[PDB]
Amino acid sequence: PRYHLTRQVTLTDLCQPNAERAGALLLALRHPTDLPHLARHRAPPGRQTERLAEAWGQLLEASESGCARAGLVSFNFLVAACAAAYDARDAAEAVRAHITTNYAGARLDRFSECLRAMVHTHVFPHEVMRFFGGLVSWVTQDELASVTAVCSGPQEATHTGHPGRPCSAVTIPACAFVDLDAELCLGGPGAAFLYLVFTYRQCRDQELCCVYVVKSQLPPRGLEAALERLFGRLRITTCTYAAFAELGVMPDDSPRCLHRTERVGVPVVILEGVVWRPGGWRACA
Amino acid sequence: ERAAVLQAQRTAAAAALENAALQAAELPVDIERRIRPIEQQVH
Amino acid sequence: MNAHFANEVQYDLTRDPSSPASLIHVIISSECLAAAGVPLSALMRANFRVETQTRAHATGDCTPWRSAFAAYVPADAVGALIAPVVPAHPDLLPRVPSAGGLFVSLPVACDAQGVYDPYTVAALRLAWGPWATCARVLLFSYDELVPPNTRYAADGARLMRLCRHFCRYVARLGAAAPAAATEAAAHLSMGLPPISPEEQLTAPGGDTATAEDVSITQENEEILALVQRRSLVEWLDRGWEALAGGDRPDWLWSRRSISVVLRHHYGTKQRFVVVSYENSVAWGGRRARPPRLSSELATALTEACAAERVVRPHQLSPAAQTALLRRFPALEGPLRHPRPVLQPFDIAAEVAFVARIQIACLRALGHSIRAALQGGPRIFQRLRYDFGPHQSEWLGEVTRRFPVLLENLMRALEGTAPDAFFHTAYALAVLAHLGGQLVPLSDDIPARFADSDAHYAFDYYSTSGDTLRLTNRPIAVVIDEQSKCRFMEGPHRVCEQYLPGESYAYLCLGFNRRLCGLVVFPGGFAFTINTAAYLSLADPVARAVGLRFCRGAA
Amino acid sequence: CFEADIAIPSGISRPDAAALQRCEGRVVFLPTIRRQLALADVAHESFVSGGVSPDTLGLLLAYRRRFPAVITRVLPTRIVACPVDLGLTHAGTVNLRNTSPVDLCNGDPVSLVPPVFEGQATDVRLESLDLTLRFPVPLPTPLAREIVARLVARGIRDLNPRTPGELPDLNVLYYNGARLSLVADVQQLASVNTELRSLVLNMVYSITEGTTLILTLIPRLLALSAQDGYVNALLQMQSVTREAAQAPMLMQDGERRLPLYEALVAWLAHAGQLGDILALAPAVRVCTFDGAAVVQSGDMAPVIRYP
């Protein structure tokens, strides 16, 4: 009802929202203790399915589940772990100088191996680490976590201005200037429509991983042909690359920004006021 | 009508020179490998 | 590069059963187009359509026009395959420049257990636009096109220079190379000047079966001995996958075996290139389906005429004729036909096929001009153009000026080349009538020329000064005692704005699908000519004419 | 609603102001999200591309990259439109006008189709503001998916002639009765070609390795034909399935990948999505509060969200 709260209790083995900002684009870790099984399934047999059986098992080595399940994945944890992967180096790698000095690359180095291992046996990282929200409160303990980081529509980025009279809260960073892909340089007035695309390269760049947000005034039917155009990573043949879901609407193109100040100087984009339509994924081609 | 044909056959015979000259580009070539590494065996 | 590759996807056609074929990569350079009559500026303005058809030498029909591909790139066209250009790294391979032209591979008619037929011509056509003025025609026989073997021996020096230039690029640039490129360099230094692509043509080395060249070396280095007593190519992929960032199947065969053979053109003394890769399903590839070519007709009719010293094989001995016919049975055409419409055993047999049509129409013109102008004529007029009072004294000259023109029109009709005659209106109006005894080529004919007989189609010659043609386009003017003129519906030519016979210094000359033509003079003074009473074109002669000059409309 | 307005820009033909009154509940394709916008991008002159007007397959591609909007309230100054793509958050269920010869159902998904009917052109003309208006025809979605397959295949017959001139027209439709004839006037090629290629390229990926084992059971299909009712009615007479009847190809690597289960996945990925990649997305659903089971031609049906 244009105001909501959500809560999930996890570890600070992941994100450590005390080390994060007020605004972070958190993922969950849905199906967290999963993927020894789907490592074996869904893949052609020339993939040697005994890889992800150890790969995530080295992740939780860096992080026993207990009663606090592994979840609440940060936005930072994918950018820096794919910083060596995608076509941005020493600028996407500044996100690694953000994590290891505030969060830890010990958990990144096990997971950057997963980013070559999950995509190896066709266990693609879409529909795992589902969207959760914008890190409203961080009522976490010392080594444990209790976060309210509301899902559920536009209210996450409305309930940002009301709590603090001075300046603005959250205000939804992009966490890398390489991220927030400036699509539609053919510029005009309107509202922004935000999406979460994982662009792949399968056996060319040896199972590439990518996390960035697009910028478009485009419908979901005007986004799939926009997903066929503008890419140079078509050179594959397996298949089902470039999944995407809706991060929702920023109902203003006027409030985007260009900064390099956060929390290590990391480039960052302020985005004020967002209808967080949670959307749905699609991956076929 | 003859003068076009009598030219086009002549242009063919002008081209058949370097069709054959580049085909005769092995006559000082096909002899070195069949003589030179055989005489130091005799040595 | 890819125009050689995408035509192989049309060679991947296969499916429904038909006479089995091949494919030859042929690189025409700049002056072989320029001496042909191809404007190099207009094709420089990369995928481009080429209409191709193939023609036998002795007898028979032709192929319909096949839509093909092209890649016209002004560069070192030999050196661009050999030293390609990464967008980030154009100095990956510095080279020596050369001439350049269009990249077009061309298919080959064969047999079951293919014995290719020399003297038989595949005809190219470059279409700048629709018009016949935007068209040229090229001639290529298989004697011109097919070498017996290629020269992949020149590919041996090239590939290890590639590994040294991956050893050269990282050492110059240093730490600016990324993590996948700083590995694959030194993995090519543990495996052992510019690259001139023209030396791969001019160094005398080619292909050999080499089984005779192993026994000639095994019995050579045993004399010697009796007296005495992952590869580098896989590191080339990461050499490209780090410097480019992708696979690029265009560049994938620049790493494999490349033969670059020089040949020559029998029409204008020119040179061109015969290319075969390793992984090409085309001819000379090392992944190719049998049947392949056989150089047997190029050795039978030669040596039976060379050992017998028979200079022309119609002077071949009667047993020496039929014994070749007992060997190769497709030669009954060029040896035992009474009047073949294509001339047997000549180089310009396709050219002499054309020049007859240039002749036979001029007599159909020249004895028809005499027909309507037998004696003193009465022509009175056919159009409606009114005079001013002193304007009649201009026609006082046209009385005196008149008879020198009709020589010089026919002199200019002689004076054109027949290759330049087929772009004019009379050479296509007959094709609109020989298709009526089928849509002729370049589609210069409008949609409404085939409706009435009142749709004529003009050419325009200069009356005064020199008697010269003043058009590119056949200008089709619909004509209604009297009848006033009317145009049709619709890069800038001067004379194309007026009605026929409307003004001075213009001779107007129109023709029909009925092939009853007009000769329109300024002032309405015009008259029909029954050239249909003088066109003597035999249909079996004309049926090889139309099929080379018609287009099957969809 | 997240209110969006379109003003009355310049002048009024005095009966044509009443023509905007009887368009309440129709759909405007405005290619933006604005707080105010001119009426110039609204009409079909904006639907016309550079030099040429789209065909009824190109208008599908023209209705692809624009945004539908619902006429909510009609002022003499403005027209308030609600942005369907975002502002469908209506528990008041903002109302639409059915302009279609079919009496629908209750509970149909409703997708929008360009006017292609023989007698429901929806042509209203403004001469003070020189504009032409084609309203889309809201229809039920299986009947909508029965139309778009016809019009592309009719343009598939625009590529190849070959056959004699008596072709099956693809111009007789069937809903419980109700013989419908549509318009076949012009077929632009690029609207056919790009629609044909995605019909080709998706049907490529929808075949996989384990798909091939299913092809063996094609003679098994006709064994059920002469021994039941359901199968024999399922097997169409104008089908290639009755025509093709007149094998593992072992290649077995590993055999623990579930090859038959993996076949039905990627087939559903692309051949399962063939109505929505060719046509517009359905987001309108029939929902009447009074218990009325059907909605008459010309009525004002209440409209709820995505199906």
UniProtKB/TrEMBL annotation, chain A:
What fragment of the full-length protein is this?
106 to 466 of 466
Biological process terms from the Gene Ontology for this record are: viral capsid assembly
MF (Gene Ontology): DNA binding
Q: Which cysteines are joined by disulfide bonds?
A: C82-C209
Q: Which gene encodes it?
A: UL38
Q: Does the keyword Ligase apply?
A: no
Q: Does the keyword Transport apply?
A: no
- Output this protein's name: Capsid triplex subunit 1
One GO cellular component this record assigns the protein to is: viral capsid
Keyword list, A-Z: Capsid protein, Host nucleus, Virion
Q: According to the entry, what is the taxonomic lineage of the organism?
A: Viruses, Duplodnaviria, Heunggongvirae, Peploviricota, Herviviricetes
UniProtKB/TrEMBL annotation, chain D:
MF GO annotations: structural molecule activity
Q: Which organism is it from?
A: Human herpesvirus 2 (HHV-2)
Which Pfam families does the record match to this protein? Herpes_V23
Its lineage opens with: Viruses, Duplodnaviria, Heunggongvirae, Peploviricota, Herviviricetes
- Please identify the protein, giving its name as recorded: Capsid triplex subunit 2
Q: HAMAP family under this entry? A: HSV_TRX2
Keyword Nucleotide-binding among record annotations: no
User: Which cysteine residues pair off into disulfide bonds?
Assistant: C1-C82
InterPro entries on file: Herpes_capsid_2
**Gene Ontology CC: one annotated term:** viral capsid
| Keyword list, A-Z | Capsid protein, Host nucleus, Virion
